[PDB]
Amino acid sequence: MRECISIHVGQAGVQIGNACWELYCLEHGIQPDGQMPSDKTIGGGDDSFNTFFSETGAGKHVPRAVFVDLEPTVIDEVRTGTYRQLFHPEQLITGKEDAANNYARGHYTIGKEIIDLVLDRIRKLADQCTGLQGFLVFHSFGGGTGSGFTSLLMERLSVDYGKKSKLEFSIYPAPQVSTAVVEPYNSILTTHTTLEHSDCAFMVDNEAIYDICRRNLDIERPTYTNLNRLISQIVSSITASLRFDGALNVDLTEFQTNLVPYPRIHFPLATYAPVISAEKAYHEQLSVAEITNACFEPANQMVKCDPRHGKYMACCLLYRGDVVPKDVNAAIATIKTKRSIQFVDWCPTGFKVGINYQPPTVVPGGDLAKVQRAVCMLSNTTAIAEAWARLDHKFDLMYAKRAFVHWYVGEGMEEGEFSEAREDMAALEKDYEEVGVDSVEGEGEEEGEEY
Amino acid sequence: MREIVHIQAGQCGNQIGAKFWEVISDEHGIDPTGSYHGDSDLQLERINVYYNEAAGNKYVPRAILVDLEPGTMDSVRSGPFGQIFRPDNFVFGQSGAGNNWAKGHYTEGAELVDSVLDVVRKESESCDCLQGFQLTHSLGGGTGSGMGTLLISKIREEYPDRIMNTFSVVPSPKVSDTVVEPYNATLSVHQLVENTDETYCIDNEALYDICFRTLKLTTPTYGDLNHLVSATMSGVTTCLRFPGQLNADLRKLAVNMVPFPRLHFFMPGFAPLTSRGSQQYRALTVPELTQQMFDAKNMMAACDPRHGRYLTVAAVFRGRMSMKEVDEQMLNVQNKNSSYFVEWIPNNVKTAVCDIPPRGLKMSATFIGNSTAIQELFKRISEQFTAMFRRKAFLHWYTGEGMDEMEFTEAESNMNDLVSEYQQYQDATADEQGEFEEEGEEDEA
Amino acid sequence: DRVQSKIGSLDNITHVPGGGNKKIETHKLTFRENAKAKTDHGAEIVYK
Numbered sequence: 032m033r034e035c036i037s038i039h040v041g042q043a044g045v046q047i048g049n050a051c052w053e054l055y056c057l058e059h060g061i062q063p064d065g066q067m068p069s070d071k072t073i074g075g076g077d078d079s080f081n082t083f084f085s086e087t088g089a090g091k092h093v094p095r096a097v098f099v100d101l102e103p104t105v106i107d108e109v110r111t112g113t114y115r116q117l118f119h120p121e122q123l124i125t126g127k128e129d130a131a132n133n134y135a136r137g138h139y140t141i142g143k144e145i146i147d148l149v150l151d152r153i154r155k156l157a158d159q160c161t162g163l164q165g166f167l168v169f170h171s172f173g174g175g176t177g178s179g180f181t182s183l184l185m186e187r188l189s190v191d192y193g194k195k196s197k198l199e200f201s202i203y204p205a206p207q208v209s210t211a212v213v214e215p216y217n218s219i220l221t222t223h224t225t226l227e228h229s230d231c232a233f234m235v236d237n238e239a240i241y242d243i244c245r246r247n248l249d250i251e252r253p254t255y256t257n258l259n260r261l262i263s264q265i266v267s268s269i270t271a272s273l274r275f276d277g278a279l280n281v282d283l284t285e286f287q288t289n290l291v292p293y294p295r296i297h298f299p300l301a302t303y304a305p306v307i308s309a310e311k312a313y314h315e316q317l318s319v320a321e322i323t324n325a326c327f328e329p330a331n332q333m334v335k336c337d338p339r340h341g342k343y344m345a346c347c348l349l350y351r352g353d354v355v356p357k358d359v360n361a362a363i364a365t366i367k368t369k370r371s372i373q374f375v376d377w378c379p380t381g382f383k384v385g386i387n388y389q390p391p392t393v394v395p396g397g398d399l400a401k402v403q404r405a406v407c408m409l410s411n412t413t414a415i416a417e418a419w420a421r422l423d424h425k426f427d428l429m430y431a432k433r434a435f436v437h438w439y440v441g442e443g444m445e446e447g448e449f450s451e452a453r454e455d456m457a458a459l460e461k462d463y464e465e466v467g468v469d470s471v472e473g474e475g476e477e478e479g480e481e482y
Numbered sequence: 483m484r485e486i487v488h489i490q491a492g493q494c495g496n497q498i499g500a501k502f503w504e505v506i507s508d509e510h511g512i513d514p515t516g517s518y519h520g521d522s523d524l525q526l527e528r529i530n531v532y533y534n535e536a537a538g539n540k541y542v543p544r545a546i547l548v549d550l551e552p553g554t555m556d557s558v559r560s561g562p563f564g565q566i567f568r569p570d571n572f573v574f575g576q577s578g579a580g581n582n583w584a585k586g587h588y589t590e591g592a593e594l595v596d597s598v599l600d601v602v603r604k605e606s607e608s609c610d611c612l613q614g615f616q617l618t619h620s621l622g623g624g625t626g627s628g629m630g631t632l633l634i635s636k637i638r639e640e641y642p643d644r645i646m647n648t649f650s651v652v653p654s655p656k657v658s659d660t661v662v663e664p665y666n667a668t669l670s671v672h673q674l675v676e677n678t679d680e681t682y683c684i685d686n687e688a689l690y691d692i693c694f695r696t697l698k699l700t701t702p703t704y705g706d707l708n709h710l711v712s713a714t715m716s717g718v719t720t721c722l723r724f725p726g727q728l729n730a731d732l733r734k735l736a737v738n739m740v741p742f743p744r745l746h747f748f749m750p751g752f753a754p755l756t757s758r759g760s761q762q763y764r765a766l767t768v769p770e771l772t773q774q775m776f777d778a779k780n781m782m783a784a785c786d787p788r789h790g791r792y793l794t795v796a797a798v799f800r801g802r803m804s805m806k807e808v809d810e811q812m813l814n815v816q817n818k819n820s821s822y823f824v825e826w827i828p829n830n831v832k833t834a835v836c837d838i839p840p841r842g843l844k845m846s847a848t849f850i851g852n853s854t855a856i857q858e859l860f861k862r863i864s865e866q867f868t869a870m871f872r873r874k875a876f877l878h879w880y881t882g883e884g885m886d887e888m889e890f891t892e893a894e895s896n897m898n899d900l901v902s903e904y905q906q907y908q909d910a911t912a913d914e915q916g917e918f919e920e921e922g923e924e925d926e927a
Numbered sequence: 928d929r930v931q932s933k934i935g936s937l938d939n940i941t942h943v944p945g946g947g948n949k950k951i952e953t954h955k956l957t958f959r960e961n962a963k964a965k966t967d968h969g970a971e972i973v974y975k
């Protein structure tokens with residue numbers, strides 16, 4: 032009766048789609064072949080799966096999801112894979128050659144060729160829905176398709192669907208790690224495009240999560256397969272309301288009203304607690320308040336910028352499992368009390384709150400263990416201006432030499448657009464800086480007797 | 483014969499809706515099938531107040547349910563008592579509200595208010611005499627907030643000479659549940675001050691004190707909170723449904739409790755409230771009610787009314803009470819708190835006393851006060867507004883619905899006027915005679 | 928062009944004094960006259 036569309040773009044995106052849908056079947060009791068475990072009727076009514084899967088056939092549940100990369104490998108490994116009977120083959124879309132870490136290939140000379148093919152299958156999945164809520168879109172900034180084909184797709188999505196929300200869900204590039212040299216150019220050339228077209232973006236970071244995997248989770252040798260399974264436990268908790276009833280409910284069109292004080296500042300960071308082995312949960316009790324304070328510790332944040340380095344503007348709490356609303360109100364009030372947990376000096380009502388009755392299930396035999404209660408959190412903060420400044424500095428150092436430029440400009444893209452993308456991010460640095468000002472409107476600042 | 487319409491709107495509004503419809507139905511021995519089974523003949527007597535008759539001993543409530551999504555109402559329809567309701571009266575969107583009050587008042591609630599007024603025309607014309615509408619909504623919310631404002635904007639002129647009784651959960655005194663709370667609330671009151679006859683202010687943070695202090699709960703749910711405001715709603719409307727020794731209905735309550743046409747913001751309170759243990763370690767009497775009924779920490783607004791002055795009070799008792807023992811405790815309060823009432827309104831209390839107590843109680847009282855203290859809420863709401871509006875933050879989601887950036891300031895100007903009205907009456911002096919200069923004159927030396 | 932923020936938080940700085948609105952009581956102006964003289968002399972008076 033209301034519905035969501037998911038989109039997986041580039042090898043990050045696809046591999047998270049191959050992690051998230053796995054969880055989504057268990058979270059609904061669906062099987063790896065889109066069946067319920069049984070033919071014969073049990074229980075009565077919902078079947079709360081309508082917002083995620085179209086029901087077909089003898090009660091075969093088809094996930095509401097389109098997949099794109101311009102290499103076929105990554106989608107051929109789903110087409111031949113474990114979940115080969117869950118996904119629909121029209122919705123598994125492949126290219127002939129990857130954008131090869133080049134935005135101009137991603138966005139133009141290769142990416143142009145299947146944009147209408149992708150959009151028509153998106154049309155066909157929208158015409159399948161009873162009430163479209165909008166789009167959740169998955170990529171990285173590193174990728175040439177994760178940048179090029181995402182940005183192209185969100186331009187097209189605004190033609191076809193106008194005001195309908197478009198929420199981004201993205202592997203934000205790390206502060207000292209990279210897997211690629213040209214990552215800072217693909218990182219800007221997408222952002223320059225999607226700020227004027229998407230409604231939010233919720234960041235998460237490889238190196239941050241690597242740190243948490245080792246420090247907290249006790250995982251010495253973490254994989255991407257842990258990474259994306261921790262990332263699926265994020266977006267399961269951002270979509271718990273759209274899957275279950277709960278004491279407080281938060282729709283896909285809520286989060287933008289809450290988290291976005293001006294359309295330029297639409298880039299929160301996503302955090303989740305607790306993240307530990309079972310072996311550590313036997314020396315803990317994990318109260319509501321405990322886990323809510325754990326979502327603020329700098330060592331627990333899943334974007335690596337330190338939240339001491341700026342000021343909160345906006346927050347959303349997203350609880351699951353054994354949580355009651357008083358316990359939360361007191362967790363929030365005592366974090367609010369801490370003016371070390373500092374908010375921008377204009378923000379009064381900093382928090383939004385969701386509460387689901389249903390706990391997260393985990394995948395069997397794997398690295399993630401059960402808890403009695405859990406919290407995701409989404410927070411917009413001035414402290415991330417150090418990582419945007421990292422994406423400044425990394426662009427500026429190579430672009431002063433015009434290094435790697437000939438790959439993008441050899442796809443016919445222009446030096447003019449390249450410079451405007453950097454200029455839009457020089458405006459973005461002043462956008463973060465102004466929200467950082469304590470609403471100054473004269474020649475100094477003022478105070479009472481004591482703070 | 484005398485009748486009420488119920489409306490529920492927004493998540494909180496449909497949760498206090500689903501619990502009020504448990505409370506009142508069980509108080510009538512209405513079964514969850516919608517079958518009448520009341521264990522007194524006096525339950526069937528005024529059943530038309532809250533219900534309409536159907537085929538074969540079935541009844542449906544005169545309750546109308548609104549949303550911009552299916553999701554909350556699905557849990558009504560599946561949850562307990564869900565089957566008393568007429569499924570025609572379920573009026574819900576497939577759109578969301580986004581915590582955007584403009585998305586309700588101007589655009590996507592505007593795409594459905596005509597389907598709500600549809601059910602108001604069907605049900606309100608079951609009534610011999612409609613006395614009023616009873617509306618459970620949000621104020622700081624986006625759903626309930628955004629739906630009641632446009633709805634009253636139409637019910638207040640189809641039915642201009644009926645009453646309009648609102649229960650509104652308000653923004654919290656120390657936290658937020660939603661980011662945009664200051665905006666939704668300031669813009670809702672700008673409509674509702676002009677058009678409501680009664681608004682209770684209901685505060686979770688006040689309720690959560692009670693759950694810690696009087697009820698002594700460890701994991702207090704929303705359900706627990708919802709049983710106390712539905713017990714409030716049942717309580718204030720007890721004399722509408724049963725005999726009493728001192729009757730009153732919504733019209734009798736408003737004329738004693740609203741002294742000027744904007745000063746209809748009320749705090750409730752409820753008595754008794756103890757824990758499941760501590761009940762046994764005090765007595766229960768008229769003074770034991772009163773001991774808790776006036777007591778500022780037990781108000782369901784955390785205003786600590788000893789900051790301000792009561793204009794007017796209403797006390798609505800249930801169970802066999804003795805008139806001299808009630809009348810004299812209402813006055814004992816007034817003398818021994820004489821510094822906490824308005825000057826130019828004496829005899830401050832409207833006392834109503836009804837026969838039939840709650841289910842699982844022998845006595846209770848519902849407390850309704852009017853004190854200029856209530857400025858505490860709306861002041862934070864104004865300060866948390868201009869904090870946001872001095873920079874025009876969040877505005878682009880409201881202009882994205884057509885809302886003019888000027889009506890934010892018409893509301894701020896209205897909030898300055900309204901808040902200043904509590905201050906112009908707080909400790910305001912009376913008209914009496916002045917000073918006279920006089921001294922002795924020489925007669926002898 | 929050296930670049931600035933694309934946002935502009937200063938705009939409500941155009942808003943007018945104020946500050947606040949009213950107060951106005953519902954029918955009378957008691958003690959606004961601030962306790963100056965209102966009579967002349969005084970004590971014994973006349974007779975013809």
Ligand SMILES: Nc1nc2c(ncn2[C@@H]2O[C@H](COP(=O)(O)OP(=O)(O)OP(=O)(O)O)[C@@H](O)[C@H]2O)c(=O)[nH]1
Nearest residue numbers: 041042043046129130131132171173174175176177
């Ligand atoms: N967490 C995570 N990141 C991944 C995964 N696969 C790749 N990445 C990230 O994706 C970014 C690079 O993108 P690519 O892997 O080249 O994918 P692509 O978008 O298809 O690239 P093209 O060749 O341009 O199409 C880097 O930040 C990688 O760390 C994955 O499975 N999980």
Ligand SMILES: Nc1nc2c(ncn2[C@@H]2O[C@H](COP(=O)(O)OP(=O)(O)O)[C@@H](O)[C@H]2O)c(=O)[nH]1
Nearest residue numbers: 492493494497620623624625626627659704707
């Ligand atoms: N008393 C109580 N408060 C609730 C309940 N559900 C939501 N709330 C509170 O109601 C206020 C309005 O929120 P909500 O009802 O979600 O807003 P809306 O649905 O957009 O109008 C917030 O303070 C919530 O925490 C409930 O069942 N009982």
Ligand SMILES: [Mg+2]
Nearest residue numbers: 100101129176
């Ligand atoms: Mg690729």
